[PDB]
Design a protein around this ligand. Structure first.
Ligand SMILES: [Mg+2]
Ligand SMILES: [Mg+2]
Ligand SMILES: [Mg+2]
Lengths: 123, 438, 438, 139, 438, 123
């Protein structure tokens, strides 16, 4: 009988409970977006990697949901390598930041994907 | 028959259309039965009254415009009836049901009667608020994307002290579940008063959220004996700053539900709807109202989640799931969809699959419902050998394993079990669950 | 089966007892079916959960304590289940139904299920307000004694302008009827908004009362889409100083009904309850809930009148009529009364007989229901050849003729027609009615 | 012009239709003027913005579906524009006017502009209370 | 003509004076036209009425005291009319417009009519609250000095989800803009309900403020269908603790605007005013009302910002900009200022320049409007090749470059482009912008 | 395509987005005040260089707006050197503080200028 850990077990929603994605499985997830005609985009955060409540406390209000956009959504992207290339450039510039890949479905008019792609050392 | 069976009638885009499954008494022909259903659910009077001459009754009468035999059934037909827009009170599901279903079911010329479907015209749809939030807004508020949401019903439903209840809540959420839930029966009783429950559940959910970093919620049941008591419970939930409340819409009623739905919209609260008592009405094929009718009504009155059964007849369920989530659903008899239905941008409702499910059903559920659904695991979490947290971890891992596999192009129908077994090799929690349930 | 089938259990005076008509799937024995009903409607979990060890579940479980075969039916039994007092929220019919009927009806081991009766213990009865007024107080307020009350539903239900509606109201009341009524469907619609209707009906009823000298009322329908709208309508009725309002308790819901019932008590308003939608639930013998259960629930939630069908199976109806009016009703299987029921002085409810009745049914109705009842004549008044007023006069005369005859010792069953024909000799209005209807 | 002048468009029963009397500046053809009225009263942006790619703008754009010359008038046409139901707040005349008439009248390519008529679809009509009483009730 | 054309009349300091641009029908002389305008906008009756003898009508009549031909126009004159103080309701812009402009424009003797200017006497000015805050207080509250403020309209106006909308808001503000804005059309619609928008915009603006350290705001549009809905939106903005809300004063109306203006004063909220629909009224030179009249009215009703066009006829604009910001503005026909106007310390309003502007217009805008103005860049920010943040940086840098240059004594008119190009040498963001737009 | 930085990019309103002012351009800004007859004054802050919200949260309320006055407004100042001299003395005493130059327009009766003149190392 194992006891689920309490310390340093912060999670990042979808796919965060699975072992870290390898470049290959990372490329496969990006291919899923492209195949569905969803637009990939990168987001990074250095200060607050998790949800918190500083500015307000009413129902449905939380701080830390918005991260900051790395450049712009990759409209017209056709190759997963393009995305992983940006991931690499982002990491190069912010090795201390959490980086996640998100996808937008212009047809449904909403964000539809979000999975962690990089975490700083010790996370 | 003369006034009410109108096979040449062309329906108006403003008409409410009803598809009734009619079982006439022996000796009563189809046309007369259908005419009876239309008359008995609209104008129709056993004796002539002089007041009828002060109005134009053809403007207000219901019309049986079409009849078709039911395949493989003894003396049973599907009768289509059209009701003019003017018969209904705007924004009132209560009045919609009273007018169509309030009287006919007791007509003696019929041996049985079942309402199968209703075509709600867009002009009437625009008079309702609909879901307080809806699928897209809920996902944006909770910041959860690309996977079904996960919940867990706390049990035993009755018997635990409010604090012990909250303890179970914290252990469940910290393991990876998004929501925990109050049983439909849990309102306010001797051993656990509502306010104490709300308060401890709040402490538990905030601790779990702080620990994991993921937003958490607990469906706090606001169902009560009066509108006043129900509102008092919703207000305290608002005061605690929690994200979601719950209501048993059928036992509480449509009038109370609409009130709650409006308050939730005005206060940013998500609303989970439990369908307690539905089988009393929607179970028998010969008499009652099919659940799809009850589902449409809830989408109009308002709710963000609604229980929709477990599946694991499939097609019928998928049919009403489309009716709850989509903006437009075309007629499809193979799925029980008798009318094409448009919603003119009324938000969709998240269907909630619940009922004796466990890790092994994960591939099937993900496959059938897709991402936009809530999978509820009561005993499937609280029955794990290591406890609630590892029970939650097993469910979260199993789900994410299925999602990743699906996204990689794997067939969930063909290789579901393989996908789960593969995950047990690296997840002890999941391995332990798989040992107990298959 | 071990935990839930308890044939040796002695019920407590505080237990809620349920009599279910169980139709098991072929292959499922009685005892297991009954045990299933008890478990599925109380504790019972598909998988073992560790939390159960934090409580004493025997204190909260439902118990199938008795089973008996149904005569002349294939594989059907009446199972008796006891639920402890602690499972229920005080004063909440909504919670009572959710707990007992919210889940079991969909149990797969059953092919069908019907709730026939409930024994509400007096300790739970004392937690409800009950009728806002009740039979005795209503008679004292209206100053009407020794005869059934008379009402009339205005038709057409939809189509008349509020003023034309009020005109019909005045003509009906001035002829001798005590009440006129809004159809269950009449709430607030395009051609007749509620406030305009309330206002003209008020002018009509006050004019009729001034003319005849007898107190008059009109059931102003307050059923609405939300609690707020419903309350707005009740408040205006209070402002007009009128005596009675109406609610469709099943389509509006128990939560809204209880709110309305409490307001009526606090403001001196009588409350007429319409049972629209009941046949969707109480019609088939194999599945659903018998009306007697819905009647008991209304007496608890609150109402002064309740529609109870027309009769003209008799015994079953008389059985639930006793349950609505009396303070104590002993078990009587020949009338469908499965449990002895006490009400500890909770006021009785006036049963309302309605549905295609006319002058010729008067002796039968007086005989069967007695003085404490309301006889409703829609088409029976508005279909009289001379108009509403003479139509009302014919009904009032016919009734008083029957009452006098009964009081003189005449047998209404043997000489009803003779009594009516005798009255036609001096009442032209009645003579004219008799010519049209028999 | 490409996105907003849609002469083949069949109006939906849920669309709000506007009949504008357009007087273009000399040198501006009918089709472009009508397209301008539709764009300027709905989507339309002087410069391309990346956010447009997060939605399906064809679902929200106004469409000039028909144009016809005005008899006996120098350079004046009646342009018909359709606006989707989703652009409007329920029960709000204030929002209806703001959306249709709040911006176009100042468009420089036009020398003048007049709104002649609006077809209010029944689905939008049902969101308003309308007259407190009305002719019959008042009488 | 006798009673209303009074060329010898000396205006009182309490009179409201109007300058009308009159185009008489051919055959109607100036004096009669001017007399007609005065009579038709005050007393004047087509037939003599005896009631006039119960009062002294000379005390209430409007007087055309001066007429002058319009240069280079065929048959057009500027007629001056004086209205006594007693004709107007204190603090009511609604009544001021109704009295002066409610009737005359349809007078048949005129072919066209345009109100060019109004002299609001100080005794009437003191009856209004004026701007909730005004230029000085706003700068002190936001702690922003020595430069124009910068804003950005979020586009597309319709189509984005509330969360995607907030995302754009955060990226814009963090780059250096002070405000982001709701389009005038953005109130509450199917794909984005108002409350969800307010909530996400709040999260976005607080994150941007925390990141940069500079105070940020987002004009949350409160324009609505009823006063009640408008107030509900303003109240939530107060609850969120945000600094600024918005209103479309012409489509919402003066009555609703004044209510909002008063609430903003009582709750410390800044108020941004959008002039949607103005061109319907102020565009044609021959008929309507010039914008300067609409600007004066807004300063009285109340607003802290008001859209005033882009400029890049200049003089006319600068003329009404002075009327919005200054405490006293002398008559100046070369700028369309027909009357000297005093404001007795009523706060000034910040003019907002908007409409297809980009980095290259910065020197011109700074030069023409000066420090007290708000420059709005919708597509000028969201159309930058690198995104919203760098788009904001380019605008902020360009502005500060111009401000520094101006402060150093450089001529913005002569060397604007040089100033911008110089900045591109050290600002990549700006260099990139300059490549796209010139 | 450059991504605008997230970390340590706090700003100080007017002129803070331009390269740090040299003593010369700093003197030119002070000359602008004098030429307009505005009174120059110095403000410094050691604890909270940016706006925050500790004591209240209602609309228009923020903490950190007021800094502390270095001596008094320089009424009658005629030479920019006087101001820059004080800047130097202030820096000498508070090398750890943010220092800004503000100006008052007694005619308009309000503060009208505010630009950062000194920032501690690393800002
Ligand atoms: Mg449950
Ligand atoms: Mg009825
Ligand atoms: Mg705009």
């Amino acid at each position: 009988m194992q006891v689920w850990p309490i310390l340093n077990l912060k999670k990042y929603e979808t796919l965060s409970y699975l072992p870290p994605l390898t470049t290959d499985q990372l490329a496969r997830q990006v291919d899923y977006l492209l195949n569905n005609k969803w637009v990939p985009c990168l987001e990074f955060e250095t200060d607050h990697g998790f949800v918190y409540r500083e500015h307000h406390n009413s129902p449905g209000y939380y701080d830390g949901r918005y991260w900051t956009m790395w450049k712009l959504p990759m409209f017209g992207c056709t190759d997963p390598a393009q995305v992983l290339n940006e991931l690499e450039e982002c990491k190069k510039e912010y090795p201390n930041a959490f980086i996640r890949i998100i996808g937008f479905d212009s047809n449904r008019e909403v964000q539809c994907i979000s999975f962690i792609a990089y975490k700083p050392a010790g996370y | 028959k003369l006034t009410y069976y109108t096979p040449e009638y062309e329906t108006l885009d403003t008409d409410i259309l009803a598809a009734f499954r009619v079982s006439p008494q022996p000796g009563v022909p189809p046309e007369e039965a259908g005419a009876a259903v239309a008359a008995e659910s609209s104008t129709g009077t056993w004796t002539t009254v002089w007041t009828d001459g002060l109005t134009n009754l053809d403007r207000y009468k219901g019309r049986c415009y079409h009849i078709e035999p039911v395949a493989g059934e003894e003396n049973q037909y599907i009768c289509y009836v059209a009701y003019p827009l003017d018969l209904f009170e705007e924004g009132s599901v209560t009045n919609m049901f009273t007018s169509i279903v309030g009287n006919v079911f007791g007509f003696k010329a019929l041996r049985a009667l079942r309402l199968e479907d209703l075509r709600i015209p867009v002009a009437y749809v625009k008079t309702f608020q609909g879901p307080p939030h809806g699928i897209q807004v809920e996902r944006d508020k909770l910041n959860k994307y690309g996977r079904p949401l996960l919940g867990c019903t706390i049990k035993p439903k009755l018997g635990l002290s409010a604090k012990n209840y909250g303890r179970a809540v914290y252990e469940c959420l910290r393991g990876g579940l998004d929501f925990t839930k109050d049983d439909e029966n849990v309102n306010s009783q001797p051993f656990m008063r509502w306010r104490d429950r709300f308060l401890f559940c709040a402490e538990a959910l905030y601790k779990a959220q702080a620990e994991t970093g993921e937003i958490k919620g607990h469906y706090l049941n606001a169902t009560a004996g009066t509108c006043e008591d129900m509102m008092k419970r919703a207000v305290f939930a608002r005061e605690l700053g929690v994200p979601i409340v719950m209501h048993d819409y059928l036992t509480g009623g449509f009038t109370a539900n609409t009130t709650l739905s409006h308050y939730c919209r005005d206060n940013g609260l998500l609303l989970h709807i439990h369908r307690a008592m539905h089988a009393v009405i929607d179970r028998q094929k010969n008499h009652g109202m099919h659940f799809r009718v009850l589902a449409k009504a809830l989408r109009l009155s308002g709710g963000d989640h609604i229980h929709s059964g477990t599946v694991v007849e499939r097609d019928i369920t998928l049919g009403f799931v489309d009716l709850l989530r989509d903006d437009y659903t075309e007629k499809d008899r193979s799925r029980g969809i008798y009318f094409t239905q448009s919603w003119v941008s009324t938000p969709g409702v998240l269907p909630v699959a619940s009922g004796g499910i466990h890790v092994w059903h994960m591939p099937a559920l993900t496959e059938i419902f897709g991402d936009d659904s809530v999978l509820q695991f009561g005993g499937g979490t609280l029955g794990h050998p290591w406890g609630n947290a590892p029970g939650a971890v097993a469910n979260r891992v199993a789900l994410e394993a299925c999602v990743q596999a699906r996204n990689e192009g794997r067939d969930l129908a063909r290789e579901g079990n393989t996908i789960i077994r593969e995950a047990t090799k690296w997840s002890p929690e999941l391995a332990a669950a798989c040992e107990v349930w298959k």
